[PDB]
């Protein structure tokens, strides 16, 4: 009988359409993201408002992965959570990272209608009653993923901070301190959000994500994306290979229910 056990990407040949030969977790029922469509996401007049409480966000390094890059967060006391909406505890803050497109006309993972963004911010939490995230990772309600579209528009001034250091990491494995930054200066006014059970949307694909997609998006200046886009997923010394179009395409929703925290 068949028994299961090069890397991942988002290349022709390593890419989405390919992850469930590694992962066939990608075959399954709770696989994010998802197109949220809004006519079918029945407004859930339970569910909660977010409680977003950054207030002490303790952030430590940024760095580039060879797949996106990302800020690290203090996690080792409750600086930094997420509780309320959907969900039951505390979710501890330990990481964001971003998926963005070529050009602005894609990007995002999640779709809306099936519009799709220019890019996807990901605010990843785990479940405090776990004691870290190696344990967290394991449980079918082990994490909890904010996710924050981004348009073209106006800057964002809270991410100016980030874009200014973008240079310093533009290749894999590099990484730098990166103190006192505030999440906060991410959000949007509104906390409205779908959520939906769901799965990480990179390999490997494990199914313990609790989503909360905001409604409204943020707006970042054509200037800040670009930056975003001279990023490499190449090491120094080797070819260069652009960091764009990082982001997984929606996938089956299967017999889940989005659900809609406003009316
Ligand atoms: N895209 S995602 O589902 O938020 C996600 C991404 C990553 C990643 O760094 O690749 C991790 Cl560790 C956890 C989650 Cl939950
Ligand atoms: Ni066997
Ligand atoms: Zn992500």
Known sequence: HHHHHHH?????????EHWHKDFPI????????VDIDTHTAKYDPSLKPLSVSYDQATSLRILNNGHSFQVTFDDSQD?????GGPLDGTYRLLQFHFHWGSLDGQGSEHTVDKKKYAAELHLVHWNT???????????PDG????????????????????????????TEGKSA?????????????????????????????????????????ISVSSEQVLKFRKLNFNGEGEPEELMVDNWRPAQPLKNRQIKASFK
């Open 143 to 170: 994490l909890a993923v904010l996710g924050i579209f981004l348009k073209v528009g106006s800057a964002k001034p809270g991410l100016q901070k980030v874009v200014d250091v973008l240079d310093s990491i533009k």
């Open 79 to 83: 600086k930094a959570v997420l509780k």
């Open 129 to 139: 009653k776990y004691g870290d995230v190696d344990k967290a990772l394991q449980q």
């Open 8 to 16: 991942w990407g988002y290349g022709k040949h390593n890419g989405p």
């Open 177 to 217: 301190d990166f103190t006192n930054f505030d999440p906060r200066g991410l959000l949007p006014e509104s906390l409205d959000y779908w959520t939906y059970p769901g799965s990480l949307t990179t390999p490997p694909l494990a199914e313990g994500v609790t989503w909360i997609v905001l409604k409204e998006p």
């Open 26 to 33: 990608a075959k399954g029922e709770r696989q994010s993201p």
